[PDB]
Amino acid sequence: MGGVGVTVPVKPGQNVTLRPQMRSMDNYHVEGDGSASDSRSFSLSDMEAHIAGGESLKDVIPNLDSENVHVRAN
Amino acid sequence: MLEVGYTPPGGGNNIGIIAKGKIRDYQHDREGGDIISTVSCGDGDKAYRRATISKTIPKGTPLTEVVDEIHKEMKKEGIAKGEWSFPDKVKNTQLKRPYSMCGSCTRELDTLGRSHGFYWNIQNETMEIIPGNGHLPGSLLITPDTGLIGTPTITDNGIKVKALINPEARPNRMMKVKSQVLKMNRKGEDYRISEVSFNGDNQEGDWIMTLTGEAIGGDKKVDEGKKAK
Amino acid sequence: MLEVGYTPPGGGNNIGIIAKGKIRDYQHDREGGDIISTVSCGDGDKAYRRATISKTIPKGTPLTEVVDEIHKEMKKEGIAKGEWSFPDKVKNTQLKRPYSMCGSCTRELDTLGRSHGFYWNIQNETMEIIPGNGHLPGSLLITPDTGLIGTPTITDNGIKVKALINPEARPNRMMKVKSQVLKMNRKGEDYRISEVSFNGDNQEGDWIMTLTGEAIGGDKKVDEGKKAK
Amino acid sequence: MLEVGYTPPGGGNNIGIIAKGKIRDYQHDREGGDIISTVSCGDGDKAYRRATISKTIPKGTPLTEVVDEIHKEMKKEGIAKGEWSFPDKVKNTQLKRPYSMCGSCTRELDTLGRSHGFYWNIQNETMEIIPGNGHLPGSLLITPDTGLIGTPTITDNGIKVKALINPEARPNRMMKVKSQVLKMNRKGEDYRISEVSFNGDNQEGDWIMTLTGEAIGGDKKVDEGKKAK
Amino acid sequence: MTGYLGKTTNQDRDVVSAVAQSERESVWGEMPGRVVSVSADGRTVTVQPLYKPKFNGVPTDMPVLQEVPLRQAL
Amino acid sequence: MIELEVLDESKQKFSVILNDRRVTIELWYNTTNDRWSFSLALDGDNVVTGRRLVTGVDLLAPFGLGIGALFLLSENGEPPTRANLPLGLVKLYHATQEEIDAAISA
Amino acid sequence: MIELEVLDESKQKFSVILNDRRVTIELWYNTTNDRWSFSLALDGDNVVTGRRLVTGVDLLAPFGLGIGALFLLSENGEPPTRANLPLGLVKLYHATQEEIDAAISA
Amino acid sequence: MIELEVLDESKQKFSVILNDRRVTIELWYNTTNDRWSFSLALDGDNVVTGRRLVTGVDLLAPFGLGIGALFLLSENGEPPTRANLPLGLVKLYHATQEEIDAAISA
Structure with missing residues (x-):
C-alpha cells in the first residue's frame, strides 16, 4: 500500500492466482487516468496475478509452521 | 429507405421517410406461383454491432462532453446526431473519480439509462436523447x-x-x-x-x-x- | 375482486372469488364503436415488488420461525397467511452457521424453493406453502x-x-x-x-x-x- | 422410432427413420369424443440431462482425443458416434496448460462451438461434428x-x-x-x-x-x- | 424484479429477467467463514462458513465445507 | 368488524381471511333441533366441528384459535332459525381482537 | 453537395440530416411580396425564422450554425417565385463546408 | 446380432448404427454375373466399394473397420440371387465382436 508492504521474489515457474476484473483497465494502466477502450464486462484481458491461490494440493509445501507466525525466504 | 405517403390526383406529394433500412434478411416466397420478397432492414444496425469506443476519461469532466465522445464512435458507424435533452440533474453534474470504457457501446448505453433514467434511441440513423x-x-x-x-x-x-x-x-x-x-x-x-x-x-x-x-x-x-426496481 | 358463479332462477347463489385484483393495466378498445375495457390485475403484486426484509438470524433457530419472519415483511404489503405444510425433513432441521438476508424477498423465496424442493405461492392475497x-x-x-x-x-x-x-x-x-x-x-x-x-x-x-x-x-x-438439475 | 415414407401399390418401400424418440411428454385429447395422443420425444435427451464427465487433461494432447473422451460419457448415456470433420486449425493444434472439466457436458460443449465456431449436433441418437x-x-x-x-x-x-x-x-x-x-x-x-x-x-x-x-x-x-461477436 | 405490473398477464420481459435474476442468485461469491479444523499438512481447512442462503423462508445450513484449499501468501 | 352473508341453503360453506388466516366455515342446519351449526377449519385443518350457532356469545372463545370473535346478533334476541338466519333477521359478525379491546376500553 | 426538392405548395416542411444534424426546414410563400421564406430548426429548436430565400448567397452565413451552406441557384440569376421555385427553375442546394473549401482551393 | 432387411429393388441404400458408428450400406445387383454387391461408407466416407455378397464368410474381415462382422446365411448354403436375397431365403446379419467372442468361447 503505497510501496509500504511485503514482497515475494517472483521467478519464472511459480504459481499465481489470476482474477478478472468487472471491466478492463487498458488506459487506467496506460494513462493512470482511469478508463479502458470500448464498453464490456468481465474480459479475460482483465486478469491480475495475486501471490496466494495458485498451487496444487498434490504438490506439497514442506515445513508449514502451525503455532508461530513464520516468514520464509526459501 | 422506405418512402410512404399519399399522392392524390390533385393536391401534391405527402411522401416521407418512415424507416431508413440497412437490410436485415430477405427471402422470396410462393403463394400459388407468386414471388413475394420479404425484407427485414436495420436501424442503427451498424452501431448495434460494430461500434466500439476507446476511453480513458478524467475527473472533473462535465456530463455531456462524452456523450459527444460516444457519438464520435457511433458516428464512425454512420449515425447522425439528433436532439439531446438531458435531465437538469444530469446537465449540472460533475465528477469525483474516473470512468472505465472497454467493450460494447450499446451495452453501457443501456446501463446509462438505468444508471439514472434517460431515454436514448436511434430514429432512422439519427440518435435522440430525452429524459424519462x-x-x-x-x-x-x-x-x-x-x-x-x-x-x-x-x-x-x-x-x-x-x-x-x-x-x-x-x-x-x-x-x-x-x-x-x-x-x-x-x-x-x-x-x-x-x-x-x-x-x-x-x-x-x-x-x-x-x-x-x-x-x-x-x-x-x-x-x-x-x-x- | 373478481366474483364468478351461477345464479339459477331457483336454487340460490354459487358466486365466489376466483381472483382478487390489484390493477395491473387497463386499456379501452373500439370494435365498430364499442368500448371494451381490458383489465389486468395483480396477485400478491405489492409483495412481488415492494416487500424487502431486514434479517440477521442466528444459529440454532428452527426452520419455520423465519417463514414467519419473511411473512412479516410480506404482510407489511397486505398478504395473508395460508396453510403451510413443510417437508418432514424441513420441520426438524436446525443450524450450524448464520443466515444472510439482504435484497429481494421473492428472489430468495425462489432460491428457497429450489434449495429444499418445496412450493410456495400466493392465491388471492393469501400465501400457501406445500411440499413438492x-x-x-x-x-x-x-x-x-x-x-x-x-x-x-x-x-x-x-x-x-x-x-x-x-x-x-x-x-x-x-x-x-x-x-x-x-x-x-x-x-x-x-x-x-x-x-x-x-x-x-x-x-x-x-x-x-x-x-x-x-x-x-x-x-x-x-x-x-x-x-x- | 418414427418411420415415415411411401408405400405405393407397385414400387416397394421408401420408409425410413426421420426421428428416434425418447418420450418427452404425452397427453390425450377429445374433439367431440376423439382421443388424440400428443407425443413429444427426446433427441440425445438422455445426454442433455444425465451426461457428466470426469476429466483431468495433460498438456500436449492432440485436439480430438478428448472429443473421444467426452463421447465416452455421452456413450454411457446411449449416444452413437457420427462423422466428425474438425476444422483444419483444430486438427493440428496443441497445448500449453491443463483443461478443466467439471459440471455440464452440454454447457461446455456449447462453449466449444463458441470457442472456434464448429457445429456439433445429435441426429437420432448419433453425434456429428462439422466446421462452421x-x-x-x-x-x-x-x-x-x-x-x-x-x-x-x-x-x-x-x-x-x-x-x-x-x-x-x-x-x-x-x-x-x-x-x-x-x-x-x-x-x-x-x-x-x-x-x-x-x-x-x-x-x-x-x-x-x-x-x-x-x-x-x-x-x-x-x-x-x-x-x- | 418479478411482476412489474401484475397477476398473470406477466410480461414476457418479467419471466425472462426473472430467469436471469435466479441464475444471478445461483452464483457463489465471497463470504466469511469459521475454521473448524486444520489439516496436519497445513493446506486444507474444514470450514463452517458463516453464511446460510435462504431456505424454506428460514435458516437452514449448508454443510461444513471440507478439504477447502487453505491459501497462504506464498 | 364485518358481517358474513348467509345463503338460503340448509348447508353452505365459504372461506374468508380473518386476521390474515384463511378460515373455512361450514354451516349446516339440524332439523331435529331446528338449529344452525358451524364447523371451522384453519387453512385446511378442521379445528372446530359441530358447534351450535347461538346469539349473544363469542362462539370461538373456548378454542384460543387467534382469529378474533365470531358472534351472532338479533334485534330482540331471537334464536337463529332455518328461516330467520338467511333472511338477515339474525346476523353473523366477525370482530377483531383490537376492535373488541377498543370497544371495551370505550 | 445535394439538391433539396421543393413541392408545389405555398407552405411545406421537411427534415434532412445535414452534417449529421437533424435540420427541419419550413418554407412558406409570402404573396404580398411574392417571395419564399424559410425557418430552420436544429433538433427541434427554431434557430432561424422568417428568412427570405434569395439566390446566389449563403442563407445560413450570419448564424454560425455549423451545418454548411444553404443556397439557391438559377441559370440566369432570376429571383425565386411562387411558380419558378417548385418548377426547378430555381434550385435549393446544400453544400458541406469541406466541399466549399475544396472548391475554393480548386 | 441383428438381421438387416433387404428390399426387392435392384439397387438400395440404408443406414444403420453398428458399434455406434453411422454405417451407410449400398447394395446393388449385377445382372451380368447375377450376384449382389455392397459398398460400405463409414460416417460419409466410402471405405468399401463393390464387394461381392457371398454366404458363409465375414465380408468386412480384410478391412479392420472395427464395426463387427457382416455375413450372409441360407438354410442349404444357396448363393444370393436377385430373387432369393429379398425373399429372405438368404439373410444378412450383423454380429458384434463381443457376441462372436462369446460364441467362439462357448
Whole structure:
C-alpha cells in the first residue's frame, strides 16, 4: 500500500492466482487516468496475478509452521 | 429507405421517410406461383454491432462532453446526431473519480439509462436523447377532421391512437388528440410519443399507423409510470 | 375482486372469488364503436415488488420461525397467511452457521424453493406453502354428474380436467375425478391441483375452468415427475 | 422410432427413420369424443440431462482425443458416434496448460462451438461434428422431376426448399436443387443442409419436408453468414 | 424484479429477467467463514462458513465445507 | 368488524381471511333441533366441528384459535332459525381482537 | 453537395440530416411580396425564422450554425417565385463546408 | 446380432448404427454375373466399394473397420440371387465382436 508492504521474489515457474476484473483497465494502466477502450464486462484481458491461490494440493509445501507466525525466504 | 405517403390526383406529394433500412434478411416466397420478397432492414444496425469506443476519461469532466465522445464512435458507424435533452440533474453534474470504457457501446448505453433514467434511441440513423419524464419540441394534431380512426383509446397514463400513415409522426414528440370521446373521457390533448407502429398495404390495407403516448401533466412533464426496481 | 358463479332462477347463489385484483393495466378498445375495457390485475403484486426484509438470524433457530419472519415483511404489503405444510425433513432441521438476508424477498423465496424442493405461492392475497410431493387438505368432485366436460384428460403424471367454473377449485388441493373412460384408462380418482385456468363469458362463452393435477400415488404422495438439475 | 415414407401399390418401400424418440411428454385429447395422443420425444435427451464427465487433461494432447473422451460419457448415456470433420486449425493444434472439466457436458460443449465456431449436433441418437463453413459427404437431388414443391425459395446465403418427406434428408449434408426459377435467379445447385422440418399427415396433409441450406461457394465452403461477436 | 405490473398477464420481459435474476442468485461469491479444523499438512481447512442462503423462508445450513484449499501468501 | 352473508341453503360453506388466516366455515342446519351449526377449519385443518350457532356469545372463545370473535346478533334476541338466519333477521359478525379491546376500553 | 426538392405548395416542411444534424426546414410563400421564406430548426429548436430565400448567397452565413451552406441557384440569376421555385427553375442546394473549401482551393 | 432387411429393388441404400458408428450400406445387383454387391461408407466416407455378397464368410474381415462382422446365411448354403436375397431365403446379419467372442468361447 503505497510501496509500504511485503514482497515475494517472483521467478519464472511459480504459481499465481489470476482474477478478472468487472471491466478492463487498458488506459487506467496506460494513462493512470482511469478508463479502458470500448464498453464490456468481465474480459479475460482483465486478469491480475495475486501471490496466494495458485498451487496444487498434490504438490506439497514442506515445513508449514502451525503455532508461530513464520516468514520464509526459501 | 422506405418512402410512404399519399399522392392524390390533385393536391401534391405527402411522401416521407418512415424507416431508413440497412437490410436485415430477405427471402422470396410462393403463394400459388407468386414471388413475394420479404425484407427485414436495420436501424442503427451498424452501431448495434460494430461500434466500439476507446476511453480513458478524467475527473472533473462535465456530463455531456462524452456523450459527444460516444457519438464520435457511433458516428464512425454512420449515425447522425439528433436532439439531446438531458435531465437538469444530469446537465449540472460533475465528477469525483474516473470512468472505465472497454467493450460494447450499446451495452453501457443501456446501463446509462438505468444508471439514472434517460431515454436514448436511434430514429432512422439519427440518435435522440430525452429524459424519462420529458419530450422534445414538435407537435402533431390528430382529430376526426385530421386523421382519426375510431376512438382515441385511453390507457393508464396516456392514449393509443390509430390514424392514416402520414409521415411526421416520430417518437419523442407531441400529439394533440381531439375527438367526441375524449371530452366525456376527461383526457387531455397533449401526449408524448413513445411507441410508433406502421402497418400498411398499397392495394388493400389502408395506410395505418398506431401511436402510443404517455400523457403530459400540468407541469409539462410526462406521466412516467411507476418504474419497478 | 373478481366474483364468478351461477345464479339459477331457483336454487340460490354459487358466486365466489376466483381472483382478487390489484390493477395491473387497463386499456379501452373500439370494435365498430364499442368500448371494451381490458383489465389486468395483480396477485400478491405489492409483495412481488415492494416487500424487502431486514434479517440477521442466528444459529440454532428452527426452520419455520423465519417463514414467519419473511411473512412479516410480506404482510407489511397486505398478504395473508395460508396453510403451510413443510417437508418432514424441513420441520426438524436446525443450524450450524448464520443466515444472510439482504435484497429481494421473492428472489430468495425462489432460491428457497429450489434449495429444499418445496412450493410456495400466493392465491388471492393469501400465501400457501406445500411440499413438492405433497398437497393440502380439501377435496373436490368432478364427474359427468358433477360438471365434467369431455375426458378426464389423461397425462404422464395425472390429468387435465375441464368443467364449468364453480368457485372452490384452488391450487394445492385434491380433486376426485370420475367418468366412463378413466376406468379403462386405469387412472385413479384423487389428484393434486397444480394449475388452474379460468376462461368464461356472460353471454356465449360459458363458464369453463381447466385443472391440471399430478396424480397421488398409493403412498399419499404426488407423482412429482423427474426434476432435471 | 418414427418411420415415415411411401408405400405405393407397385414400387416397394421408401420408409425410413426421420426421428428416434425418447418420450418427452404425452397427453390425450377429445374433439367431440376423439382421443388424440400428443407425443413429444427426446433427441440425445438422455445426454442433455444425465451426461457428466470426469476429466483431468495433460498438456500436449492432440485436439480430438478428448472429443473421444467426452463421447465416452455421452456413450454411457446411449449416444452413437457420427462423422466428425474438425476444422483444419483444430486438427493440428496443441497445448500449453491443463483443461478443466467439471459440471455440464452440454454447457461446455456449447462453449466449444463458441470457442472456434464448429457445429456439433445429435441426429437420432448419433453425434456429428462439422466446421462452421464445412459440410459432410452425401448429396440429395431436389427437382420438379425429383420431388420439388413450388420454387426453390431463395435466401441471402442459400435456399429454403419444400419437398415430399422422403427420408434421406439429414442435417449437415448436401442438396443439389434444380428448377426453372433458380436459373434466372442465378442461384447455384449445391447447398449445405442446416435446418430440417418435417410436417405431414396420413390422410390429408401429405408428407412435406422443408430444408434450409446455406450455399456452397466456388471454394467448396459454406456461406457462413456474418457471425456477430 | 418479478411482476412489474401484475397477476398473470406477466410480461414476457418479467419471466425472462426473472430467469436471469435466479441464475444471478445461483452464483457463489465471497463470504466469511469459521475454521473448524486444520489439516496436519497445513493446506486444507474444514470450514463452517458463516453464511446460510435462504431456505424454506428460514435458516437452514449448508454443510461444513471440507478439504477447502487453505491459501497462504506464498 | 364485518358481517358474513348467509345463503338460503340448509348447508353452505365459504372461506374468508380473518386476521390474515384463511378460515373455512361450514354451516349446516339440524332439523331435529331446528338449529344452525358451524364447523371451522384453519387453512385446511378442521379445528372446530359441530358447534351450535347461538346469539349473544363469542362462539370461538373456548378454542384460543387467534382469529378474533365470531358472534351472532338479533334485534330482540331471537334464536337463529332455518328461516330467520338467511333472511338477515339474525346476523353473523366477525370482530377483531383490537376492535373488541377498543370497544371495551370505550 | 445535394439538391433539396421543393413541392408545389405555398407552405411545406421537411427534415434532412445535414452534417449529421437533424435540420427541419419550413418554407412558406409570402404573396404580398411574392417571395419564399424559410425557418430552420436544429433538433427541434427554431434557430432561424422568417428568412427570405434569395439566390446566389449563403442563407445560413450570419448564424454560425455549423451545418454548411444553404443556397439557391438559377441559370440566369432570376429571383425565386411562387411558380419558378417548385418548377426547378430555381434550385435549393446544400453544400458541406469541406466541399466549399475544396472548391475554393480548386 | 441383428438381421438387416433387404428390399426387392435392384439397387438400395440404408443406414444403420453398428458399434455406434453411422454405417451407410449400398447394395446393388449385377445382372451380368447375377450376384449382389455392397459398398460400405463409414460416417460419409466410402471405405468399401463393390464387394461381392457371398454366404458363409465375414465380408468386412480384410478391412479392420472395427464395426463387427457382416455375413450372409441360407438354410442349404444357396448363393444370393436377385430373387432369393429379398425373399429372405438368404439373410444378412450383423454380429458384434463381443457376441462372436462369446460364441467362439462357448
